[PDB]
């Protein structure tokens, strides 16, 4: 699926679990030595460098175990504590995303 969408919030990811995809699609390839994308933190790729003719949006299909952060958009403040995080955890052979605990107010 996709990360849950919180009002006035823009999810972000520091590092992508190996297996993410963005010529059909890019692919994060990693070995013991290092990890790097192909088809142009260990076990995790870094953000791919820009390449011209971009789409204004980046679409990522996320494998199990991805981690993200939620930041309130400009003009709002976080009522609760801590950078909220969302992870995908297998449950009874069903993929799902953990719900964050965050509200942005203004």
């Amino acid at each position, epitope marked *: 699926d996709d990360p849950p969408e919180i009002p006035h919030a823009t999810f972000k990811a520091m590092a992508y679990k190996e297996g993410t995809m963005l010529s059909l699609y890019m692919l994060c390839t990693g070995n013991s030595s290092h990890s790097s994308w192909d088809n142009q933190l260990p076990g995790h790729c870094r953000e791919p460098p820009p390449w011209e003719n971009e789409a204004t949006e980046r679409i990522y299909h996320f494998v199990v175990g991805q981690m993200v952060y939620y930041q*309130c958009v400009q003009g709002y403040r976080a009522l609760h*504590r801590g950078p909220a995080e969302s992870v995908c955890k297998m449950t009874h052979g069903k993929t799902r995303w953990t719900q964050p605990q965050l509200i942005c107010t203004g």
Partner: antibody, heavy 121, light 114 residues
Framework: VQLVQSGAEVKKPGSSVKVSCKASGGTFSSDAINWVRQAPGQGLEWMGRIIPIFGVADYAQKFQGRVTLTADKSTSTAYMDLSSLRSEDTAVFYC???????????????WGRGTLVTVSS | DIQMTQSPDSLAVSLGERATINCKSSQSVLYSSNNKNYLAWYQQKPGQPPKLLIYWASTRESGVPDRFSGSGSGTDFTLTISSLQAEDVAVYYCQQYYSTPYTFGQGTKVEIKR
């Protein structure tokens, strides 16, 4: 963005003082302005916080009732007011800014230079 | 009202040798959801405002030399200054931004010894 404060003051016991803190950036956008006091040869303490975008202020237990915290959105300034000055309030007061988009409780990004207040007759 | 307890109050190390500071909290600070430790260390050279040094108890902040390195978790934190140089002489404070009111430490006066 830079936090600019008022100058030094030399007041008399029983008087009152106001210390101002102004941001050279745009404004206080979902930020907070924490106040830190450091008496000479002592560790840093904590006054309280003022959240301009909310209009809500929180004080430490020790200094509740003796300090009033004010934020003016038009000029984007933060104010501290001291009532009934004793002889032992000689100290330096710093501003601190903590970004709020990630979380309510957060570290202090940027610090003001500090305002020296001397209280004596 | 989590309360800080640094030790020692003052510390004297030879030039270019490992230094260590501790920190104690009455209450645990490790937040279950994030598995992060809301602890920050500040450096305040004489007659200047303090500057941030370390945040989340391990994440070195941008522009800080690699020698500074936090560690520990729970309520037994620590800081290390490997190969201390002349610019490191200052006073280092904890902070407990887990919840309000924030509480600093007593403060440690790292001081070169000869």
């Amino acid at each position: 963005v830079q936090l600019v404060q008022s100058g030094a003051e030399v007041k008399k016991p029983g008087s009152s003082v106001k210390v101002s803190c102004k941001a050279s950036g745009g404004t206080f956008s979902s930020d907070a302005i924490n106040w830190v006091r450091q008496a000479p040869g002592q560790g840093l303490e904590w006054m309280g916080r003022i959240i301009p975008i909310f209009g809500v202020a929180d004080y430490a237990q020790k200094f509740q009732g003796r300090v009033t915290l004010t934020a003016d959105k038009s000029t984007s300034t933060a104010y501290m007011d001291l009532s009934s000055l004793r002889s032992e309030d000689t100290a330096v007061f710093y501003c601190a800014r903590e970004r709020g988009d990630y979380s309510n409780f957060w570290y202090f990004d940027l610090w003001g230079r500090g305002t020296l207040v001397t209280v004596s007759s | 009202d989590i309360q800080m307890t640094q030790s020692p109050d003052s510390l004297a190390v030879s030039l270019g040798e490992r230094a260590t500071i501790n920190c104690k909290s009455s209450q645990s600070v490790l937040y279950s959801s994030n598995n992060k430790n809301y602890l920050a260390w500040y450096q305040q050279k004489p007659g200047q405002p303090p500057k941030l040094l370390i945040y989340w108890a391990s994440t070195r902040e941008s522009g800080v030399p690699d020698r500074f390195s936090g560690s520990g978790s729970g309520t037994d934190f620590t800081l290390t200054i490997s190969s201390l140089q002349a610019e490191d002489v200052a006073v280092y404070y904890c902070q407990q931004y887990y919840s309000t009111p924030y509480t600093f430490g007593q403060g440690t006066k790292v001081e070169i010894k000869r």
